[PDB]
Design a binder for these strands. Structure first.
Ligand SMILES: N[C@H]1CCN(c2cc3c(cc2F)n2ccnc2c(=O)n3C2CC2)C1
Ligand SMILES: N[C@H]1CCN(c2cc3c(cc2F)n2ccnc2c(=O)n3C2CC2)C1
Ligand SMILES: N[C@H]1CCN(c2cc3c(cc2F)n2ccnc2c(=O)n3C2CC2)C1
Ligand SMILES: [Mn+2]
Ligand SMILES: [Mn+2]
Lengths: 150, 481, 482, 156
DNA sequence: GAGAGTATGGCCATACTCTT
DNA sequence: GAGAGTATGGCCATACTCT
């Protein structure tokens, strides 16, 4: 029964727990066009793992897992990978986050995953504005944000 | 027990972005080094791998840096170390390597196992005076070791070797420069703070790339120095050689900085195959250690080699632009700086380094003098000193008695107790007095430097001149009218 | 001609490689039980001061140190060797203490050196004990810049304890691991009576003891191996037939054979049920966890005989496997097939020699110090004259000569007097020197006794071995049936 | 690969480890297959073996042609260590078993311990067909005991 | 049937910014 | 364009002997 769980892990529960390792930095879907996105092997592995499909063909019912956990390193690059993965979720599988199936693990493994935080999306408009600014193509917006918070 | 998506994005992004800016991709304005490079250099110095001693295996250097200072992948550390060893990459190389460290053809260095390395003679000048309280030390990632926040950098490394980093929000691209020209400009600036960039340019003619070549015009350079941003045209050194029967050939002896030789050749070959260029009969690469770079292109009997050569500049990386973007870390924040600002900040680093070293030497000198004054007292009244000790039951007792009787301090009494019997001989007695007399003279010299700021500034000038004479060399890149 | 004969090249090139793989790669030393790569890893940890008390160090730093300093070979070779010494299922008495993923019984290797960290174990200290007391010989390393141990002191019998498994050229070696308590007992027995029989040694050493436990079928195989240096020992998994109500049955496997890949064994059984090679199984499961240890559960079909099916599995899968003993070790730097007694005899001699050398070293130091103290004693008794003699002298060379000629003392003693600190002139310090000398004289006598009488030296070896047995020796894990 | 005559053309086999037109380089990563121990299907499936066959382009066994030779000089350049020697023996085994004529034609060389710059290579010459056949079988063959015996007699 | 354990290193993708 | 340079590591084959 999917009512099992999958862990996305950056660096190095048999019945109910699944593990998918992600070597390297994930592609930024906000910067890339669809043909590139769909050809990325790490992206394709993730799509297949969930089996919900992307964009319009998304089916919440056809989800393999009700708990998807982003377990990344406790360093700065961990954070970056975290942002990249959330970008993919927001742009291609938004209803999953709305269904509350996505989680972020806090403290790189047995004693850890345990603390998991639910990813919740409150504002559609704010998030859209945030994603485009942080992950988008326009450099200057990103620089300004750094400036003001630096 | 829930996390907002907008809150995670903003927090996580900023954490990474700021880290990549202030501790990965951008160099410091004072020493011209990104964190990985500083750690490699300091790690060589701590392990004692200097030019005089033999080459050490790369796996040992990398492993030391990783364990001690740089908590990142071994391949990142090694690749950084490799570039500092490449004569085509660094105008004044900071690492001396043994084995295959790559070439101009884009060929990577062989794996860490098959290479070995040590620091260069010039690198010593970056580390000079590090142990004289000249720079600040911080704790490393785990707390177990301590590491330099910046290096003393006795020569102006940021402009000398240049920088090329891609951050987040921003990036940096600083070209390399001739050391003789730089120091001359530094001395000129120190004499007169109101110097113009035009006046600085009389000393510093422009960038000097390790790969030589030519810069087309002063126009792009001037904008770059004045504003900190500019595009500089770099063209290969080519000659049109004339042969028997009207046949001609083009010979390329220097290529642009950061341009892959092999890839350039492949690009020309693609143009002849695809018929996008007309006239070329044969393309050969006769590059050897004796000749340096030698690329020969044979022109057809009918073809005007001048025409073809000009087409090649327009069509291939035979002519390439360098886009100057001078961002360095100034007071631990990124800042777009012009030429004068770069020179001003480096000069201040030197002034401060020299002042701090002088203050350190003074503290030591005074400590030693104070000790010597005590030893002088003891040698004058040795017989009583000896009896005072012998009468005492413990070392604590002798200390107290020596202080109370001969008006000595605790440090002076300790030193007397620690005195070896051999110090009582004729030469040794005279040695102590002669050290004291010299030390008094030296303290005065140190005191003078610290009182008058001009004397301190002259000392900086004098030391820079010495570096220029020892390490400075000829300009390689020609700037064309 | 500037030409080489093909037969001449073949013979020379082949021999170079073969000899090197034999005496410096694949075969362990009889005295310390270590192949060159292992010795270098252990010594490298010791030299870098990475001990059980201090924290774990990054694997890339250990490997890089060993590579640069002692082992001129690929990093992956050094790391993989280090990993095995850290594995509880591989080494009966592990020599390396690791942090992170160091692999498991399922064949999965350790995480890359960048993600792992390590230090030496408490027992490894006993291999290195007294290394700095001229107990063993040091040779130059590959480049000449460093020195390294030719062999380690090895205060416990490591070759038999942890065993060996190397493939050379012309030969190979396969020595099973043993219980330390049993070994030391056998060693003490042998020291008492040199003409002890292998039968008599077997009263102490019952057989091999594998870290993975399990069961050895019969003592007949073990006897041949110990007497001849070669033989075959049957190893079978610990499996029990568990009963459920109405006659329902299951097989549970709690221990497996040594060096047997758990994952591969499971896949082979699965292959037999798929291919209809074995009939009577409904489900095969692996419930192995860190808490429970090894747990392999096989559920039997109703009204099928579990005893019969379990016995088929022994015959068909690595649930029962043989260990083929082939005891070749390096003895006087040449390969040799040795029996159990020869192994014990050589190790005992190493201990005798190590202890002799340590005692001789301590004596040289003690005597040196005593000689120095005798001079200092003279100086303190005649301090006033000593002081005047020095002050009257213009240089240190002069004072040295004058101190020797006047107070009938040696160059070493005169040097020591000159180097004396004024604080040594106090009451306490005068008494301290005397008390050191009195104690030192007593100690030199003790050392001299050990070196004179061979029985005293032999007793000392016994005493030290006993201490190791008491501190490190543990229960026998492998059961010998019948 | 090389920058027309095979006579001027020379190829270097290197055990991984600057300053070279005819000169060609083929790097061999890892230990080469022992062809004396292996059957034909395994041999031909070896990537390193396949690379070498293709490089020379003369074919093997029956189909071998001396005229087809891409390079007139074949140099075995391996590391100056014990493993270098082992790789050297392995490569010679392949030549003797599959391209005997090349050794007879004297196209094979061994470089001894800056050497590539012409500003020494030793010729491999085959004096006795019978002795070599005997030697190869003893050193690289399947029978372990013969190999042991050789080590024992010549040791140290 | 295999696989026990020391030996001999390339090849792959992504983030991030800037540009005749 | 694509590539300038620090960051985030698994996958491949062979020798050699022995039951
Ligand atoms: N399918 C792709 C995804 C990851 N990957 C990869 C990873 C590399 C590398 C080079 C790579 F191609 N690579 C190249 C140099 N260093 C590394 C390195 O450390 N890594 C590891 C950390 C991710 C292959
Ligand atoms: N699944 C394991 C069980 C034993 N086995 C095996 C055994 C071999 C061999 C080759 C083998 F693969 N093998 C190959 C050549 N000679 C032998 C040989 O003597 N034996 C020993 C058991 C008799 C693989
Ligand atoms: N020709 C390529 C494909 C086979 N090969 C290879 C090489 C390895 C490895 C594992 C390998 F598969 N390998 C695995 C672990 N260490 C090594 C290793 O050092 N090497 C290098 C020295 C030979 C080299
Ligand atoms: Mn990390
Ligand atoms: Mn080698």
């Amino acid at each position: 029964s999917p009512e099992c769980e999958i862990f996305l892990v950056e660096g190095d529960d048999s019945r109910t727990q699944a593990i998918l390792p992600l070597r390297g930095k994930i592609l930024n879907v906000e910067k890339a066009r669809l043909d590139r996105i769909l050809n990325n092997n790490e992206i394709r592995q993730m799509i297949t793992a969930f089996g919900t499909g992307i964009g319009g063909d998304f089916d919440l019912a056809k989800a393999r897992y009700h708990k998807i956990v982003i377990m990344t390193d406790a360093d700065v690059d961990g954070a970056h990978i975290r942002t990249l993965l959330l970008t993919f979720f927001y742009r291609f599988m938004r209803p999953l986050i709305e269904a509350g199936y996505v989680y972020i693990a806090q403290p790189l493994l047995w004693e850890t995953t345990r603390a998991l935080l639910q990813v919740k999306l409150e504002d559609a408009i704010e998030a859209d504005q945030t994603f485009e600014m942080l992950m988008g193509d326009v450099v200057e917006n990103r620089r300004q944000f750094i400036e003001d918070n630096a | 027990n829930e996390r907002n998506i907008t809150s995670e994005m903003r927090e996580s992004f900023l954490d990474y972005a700021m880290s990549v800016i202030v501790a990965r991709a951008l160099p410091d304005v004072r020493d011209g080094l990104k964190p990985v490079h500083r750690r490699i250099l300091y790690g060589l110095n701590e392990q004692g791998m200097t030019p005089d001693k033999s080459y050490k295996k790369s796996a040992r250097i990398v492993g030391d840096v990783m364990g001690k200072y740089h908590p990142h992948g071994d391949s990142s550390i090694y690749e950084a170390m490799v570039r500092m060893a490449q004569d085509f990459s660094y105008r004044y190389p900071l690492v001396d390597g043994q084995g295959n460290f790559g070439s101009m053809d884009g060929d990577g260095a062989a794996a860490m196992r098959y290479t070995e390395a040590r620091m260069t003679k010039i690198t010593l000048e970056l580390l000079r005076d590090i142990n004289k309280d000249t720079i600040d030390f911080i704790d490393n990632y785990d707390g177990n070791e301590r590491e330099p926040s910046v290096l003393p950098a006795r020569f102006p490394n940021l402009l000398a070797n240049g920088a090329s980093g891609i951050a987040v929000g921003m990036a940096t691209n600083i070209p390399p420069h001739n050391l003789t020209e730089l120091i001359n400009g530094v001395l000129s600036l120190s004499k007169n703070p109101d110097i113009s960039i035009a006046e600085l340019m009389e000393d510093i003619e422009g960038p000097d790339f390790p790969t030589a070549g030519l810069i087309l015009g002063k126009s792009g350079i001037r904008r770059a120095y004045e504003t900190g941003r500019g595009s500089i045209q770099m063209r290969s050194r080519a000659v049109i050689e004339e042969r028997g029967g009207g046949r001609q050939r083009i010979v390329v002896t220097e290529i642009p900085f950061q341009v892959n030789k092999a890839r350039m050749i492949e690009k020309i070959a693609e143009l002849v195959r695809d018929k996008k260029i007309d006239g070329i009969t044969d393309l050969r690469d006769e590059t050897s250690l004796r000749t340096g770079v030698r690329v020969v292109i044979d022109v057809r009997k009918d073809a005007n080699a001048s025409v073809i050569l000009n087409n090649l500049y327009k069509q291939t990386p035979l002519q390439t632009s360098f886009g100057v973007n001078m961002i360095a870390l100034v007071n631990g924040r990124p800042k777009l700086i012009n030429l004068k600002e770069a020179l001003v900040h480096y000069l201040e680093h030197q002034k401060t380094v020299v002042r701090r070293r002088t203050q350190y030497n003074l503290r030591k000198a005074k400590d030693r003098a104070h000790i010597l004054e005590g030893l002088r007292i003891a040698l004058d009244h040795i017989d009583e000193i000896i009896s005072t000790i012998r009468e005492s039951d413990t070392d604590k007792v002798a200390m107290e008695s020596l202080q109370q009787r001969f008006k000595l301090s605790e440090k002076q009494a300790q030193a007397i107790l620690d005195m070896r019997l051999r110090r009582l001989t004729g030469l040794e007695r005279d040695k102590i007095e002669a050290e004291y007399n010299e030390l008094l003279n030296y303290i005065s010299e140190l005191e003078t430097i610290l009182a008058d700021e001009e004397v301190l500034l002259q000392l900086v000038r004098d030391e820079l001149t010495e570096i220029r004479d020892r390490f400075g060399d000829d300009r390689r890149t020609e700037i064309q009218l």
